[PDB]
């Protein structure tokens, strides 16, 4: 169908808070193979972030029930099977996003800002796979997340200002990856504190962009105080 109709459907899906529809429209925009403008890339990401986010959050509630039900075997089985159905959707969605990234988005990216945004995405989606990873894949998945992040982060440090939201958002997520997935609060703190100081030191920016950057810096500070007890 027509790219621009698909994009309009994505925006209507978004106003309706129907993120699965929204993702399906943006996915098929992507699959026509032309590079996405910013707006479109934002719609794609917003859609899939909500789709995967509803499942991660459901996965958490149910995993946690499954843990509390050891070892009432029949109840635990109910929770575990439901957990697996959720995980089944979570993996399919991560796989889809990761395949889009590899076939279309990262290949087509013609500016640094896009490259970084998409490699950050790749880190994020491998990270969501890691959150629920079966012991025998976990290692490969975690390596895939950390390399995508690390690659995004190197490009952003050479190509974008320390106060750019994309680069800060990436420092936030990469540092959460180190805490939550790699269990290195050290690494996580030094990453976050580093990005936060670099942005302060630059700090110039306008009144709106000044907010976005501040909001993300607030998240970095918040995690920092948290993680240092």
């Amino acid at each position: 169908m027509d790219k621009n109709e698909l994009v309009q459907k994505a925006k209507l899906a978004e106003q309706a808070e129907r993120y699965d529809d929204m993702a399906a429209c943006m996915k098929s925009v992507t699959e026509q193979g032309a590079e996405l403008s910013n707006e479109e890339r934002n719609l794609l990401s917003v859609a899939y972030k909500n789709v995967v986010g509803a499942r991660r959050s459901s996965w958490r509630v149910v995993s946690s029930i499954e843990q509390k039900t050891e070892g009432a075997e029949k109840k635990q089985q109910m929770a575990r099977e439901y957990r697996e159905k959720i995980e089944t959707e979570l993996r399919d969605i991560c796989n889809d996003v990761l395949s889009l990234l590899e076939k279309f988005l990262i290949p087509n990216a013609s500016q640094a800002e896009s490259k970084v945004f998409y490699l950050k995405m790749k880190g994020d989606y491998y990270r969501y796979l890691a959150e629920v990873a079966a012991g025998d894949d976990k290692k490969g998945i975690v390596d895939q997340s950390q390399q995508a992040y690390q690659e995004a982060f190197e490009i952003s440090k050479k190509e974008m200002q320390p106060t750019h939201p994309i680069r800060l958002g990436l420092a936030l997520n990469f540092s959460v990856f180190y805490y939550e997935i790699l269990n290195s609060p050290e690494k996580a703190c030094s990453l976050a504190k580093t990005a936060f100081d670099e942005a302060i030191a630059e700090l110039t920016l306008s009144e709106e962009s000044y907010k976005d950057s501040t909001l993300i810096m607030q998240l970095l500070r918040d995690n920092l105080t948290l993680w240092t007890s």
Binding site: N42, L43, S45, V46, G53, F117, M121, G169, E208, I216
Partner: peptide, 11 residues
């Protein structure tokens, strides 16, 4: 804004 939301920020 659109961009903040699109960045899928961790907590």
């Amino acid at each position: 804004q659109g961009l903040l939301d699109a960045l899928d920020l961790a907590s």
